[PDB]
Amino acid sequence: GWVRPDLGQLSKVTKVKTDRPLPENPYHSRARPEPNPVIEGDLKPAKHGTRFFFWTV
Amino acid sequence: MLKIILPSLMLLPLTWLSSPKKTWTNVTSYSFLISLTSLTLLWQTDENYKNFSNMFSSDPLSTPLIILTAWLLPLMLMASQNHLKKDNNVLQKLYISMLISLQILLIMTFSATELIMFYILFEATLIPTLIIITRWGNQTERLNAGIYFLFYTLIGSIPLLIALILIQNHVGTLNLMILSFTTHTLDASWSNNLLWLACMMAFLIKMPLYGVHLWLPKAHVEAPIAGSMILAAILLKLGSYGMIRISIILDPLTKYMAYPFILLSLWGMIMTSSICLRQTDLKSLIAYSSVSHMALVIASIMIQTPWSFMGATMLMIAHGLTSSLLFCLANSNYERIHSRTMIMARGLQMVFPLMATWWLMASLANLALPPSINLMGELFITMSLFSWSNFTIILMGINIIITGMYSMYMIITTQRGKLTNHMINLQPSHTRELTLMALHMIPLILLTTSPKLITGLTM
Ligand SMILES: CCCCCCCCCCCCCCCCCC(=O)OC[C@H](COP(=O)([O-])OCC[N+](C)(C)C)OC(=O)CCCCCCCCCCCCCCCCC
Structure with a gap:
């Protein structure tokens, strides 16, 4: 009772059911380093101007 | 300070917008009014300093220099408005603009509260006198003189900039009062010795110190009258003011580091007074006299005594006035006879009696006739130097003897004696130049009358 597959049938992506668990870390990755502690807060003006030598503002 | 700076700034549009028949009159009158406004800095009824703003302040040391600059601007205009009559109008206005810019930048330099701004205005004053x-x-x-002046000053001032940036990095602000309060004692290493030399050599160049004084005689000879006046009456004093301002953070190693410069000052004032004795050029003689007087100022600032500081301030003001007066008298003779030879014009007492009186009074101021502020400064410098070491009185006495000798030699060879009758082109006198001599001599008389104005920081 075998039927030859048509054109385009063997070449398509098929789902498959398995009881094998999904590997959570396939790359055996180490722990990612934490990012820099980003600074939050309101943007206050510069204290006493630019503070470039003798310039007041 | 802004009430003096702003109308001096507005003098430039006045210069460029005035009619060519009214430019000299308007600029001279408003610069006189500028000086009268600048006289309000003497209202010091307290021990405090008149800190006008965050970048401008007044001092018992800065105030006489500012007043002298504002007073010298109209005198420079009166001195220079005769050799520019055969001159283009835009060139005359440019010359007036150069003088006004010099006055503005010098006032800002003396009123500066921050040493980097002081250095910026130092070089800003370096530019237009070179142009003039x-x-x-x-x-x-004049080209070689300008090159010598410019590059002596620049090679002096570059390590000053490096030292100022180093002190700013070490302390934080480079503000004068902050440094004066949070002064730290240096540990006297080779790095600190080099730092000391870096921050002192610029001012020593512009004083000028002996051995590095070679830019001054040719610059003063080749300069026009207003340039000679502003040089000999403000810029050397600017070097001394820088020395007084920067010396507060150089403790304690200035005590032993001052040794070569004191010796250079004393022996150089003797040598330059000897050059004045044997000098064939009148402006060169006045220039070397300026070198000797500024050598006295150098020695006082190096020995760092309160008497020395007061004598330094009084000699600064007095020498500025009398050197400008001597240069103006020499320029009157130069505009007469078109020469600077010392011995060429001899019997000028006969033809110019009142000008001979001005010559005599200027020379008596030069040789420190009492009770003038010249003698006040020289005497207190001598007192402080004798306290520093009793053997300095020999060098001081030799310098005083040669000073009187070259001053009276100048008087005798320029006024006394038989008249050079071949000089047919001796115009009698200009009311302008007689006014210029009077405007030099009268403030000397008034400061002699009240010497408390120019005592300075220490007393
Ligand atoms: C008008 C005179 C010109 C010549 C003399 C000028 C001054 C001579 C003495 C000072 C050295 C040169 C200027 C250095 C300026 C900075 C000084 C400073 O910050 O010192 C502390 C610093 C030291 O830095 P520091 O103070 O941070 O030291 C760290 C110390 N510890 C680690 C203990 C905390 O000194 C220097 O960096 C000096 C290096 C100078 C090297 C280059 C010299 C070149 C030649 C100079 C003269 C060139 C012109 C003349 C040429 C000939 C003309 C005839």
Whole structure:
């Protein structure tokens, strides 16, 4: 009772059911380093101007 | 300070917008009014300093220099408005603009509260006097004189900039009062010795110190009259003011590091007074006299005594006035006879009696006739130097003897004696130049009358 597959049938992506668990870390990755502690807060003006030598503002 | 700076700034649009028949009159009158406004800095009824703003302040040391600059601007205009009559209008206005810019920048330099701004205005004052000397000088050697002046000052001032940036990095602000309060004692290493030399050599160059004084005689000879006046009456004092301002953070190693410069000052004032004795050029003689007087100022600032500081301030003001007066008298003779030879014009007492009186009074101020502020400064410098070491009185006495000798030699060879009757082109006198001599002599008389104004920081 075998039927030859048509054109385009063997070449398509098929789902498959398995009881094998999904590997959570396939790359055996180490722990990612934490990012820099980003600074939050309101943007206050510069204290006493630019503070470039003798310039007041 | 802004009430003095702003109308001095507005003098430039007045210069460029005035009619060519009214430019000299308007600029001279409003610069006189500028000086009268600048006289309000003497209202010091307290021990505090008049800190006008965050970048401008007044001092018992800065105030006489500012008043002298504001007073010298109209005198420079009156001195220079005769050799520019055969001159283009835009060039005359440019010359007036150069003088006004010099006055503005010098006032800002003396009123500066921050040493980097002091250095910026130092070089800003370096520019237009170079322009004046190079463009309106008379002989060929004005170009070499301008190069010598510019590059002596620049090679001095570059390590000053490096030292100022180092002190700013070490302390934080480079503000004068902050440094004066949070002064730290240096540990006297080779790095600190080099730092000391870096922050002192610029001012020593512009004083000028002996051995590095070679820019001054040719610059003063080749300069026009206003350039000679502003040089000999403000810029050397600017060097001394820088020395007084920067010396507060150089403790304690200035005590032993001052040794070569004191010796250079004393022996150089003797040598330059000897050059004045044997000098064939009148402006060169006045220039070397300026070198000797500034050597006295150098020695006082190096020995760092309160008497020395007061004598330094009094000698600064007195020498500025009398050196400008001597240069103006020499320029009157130069505009008469078109020469600077010492011995060429001899019997000028006969033809110019009142000008001979001005010559005599200027020379008596030069040789420190009592009770003038010249003698006040020289005497207190001598007192402080004798306290520093009793053997300095020999060098001081030799310098005083040669000073009187060259001053009276100048008087005798320029006024006394038989008249050079071949000089047919001796115009009698200009009311302008007689007024210029009077405007030099009268403030000397008034400061002699009240010497408390120019005592300075220490007393
Ligand atoms: C008008 C005179 C010109 C010549 C003399 C000028 C001054 C001579 C003495 C000072 C050295 C040169 C200027 C250095 C400026 C900075 C000083 C400073 O910050 O010192 C502390 C610093 C030291 O830095 P520091 O203070 O941070 O030291 C760290 C110390 N510890 C680690 C203990 C905390 O000194 C220097 O960096 C000096 C290096 C100078 C090297 C280059 C010299 C070149 C030649 C100079 C003269 C060139 C012109 C003349 C040429 C000939 C003309 C005839």
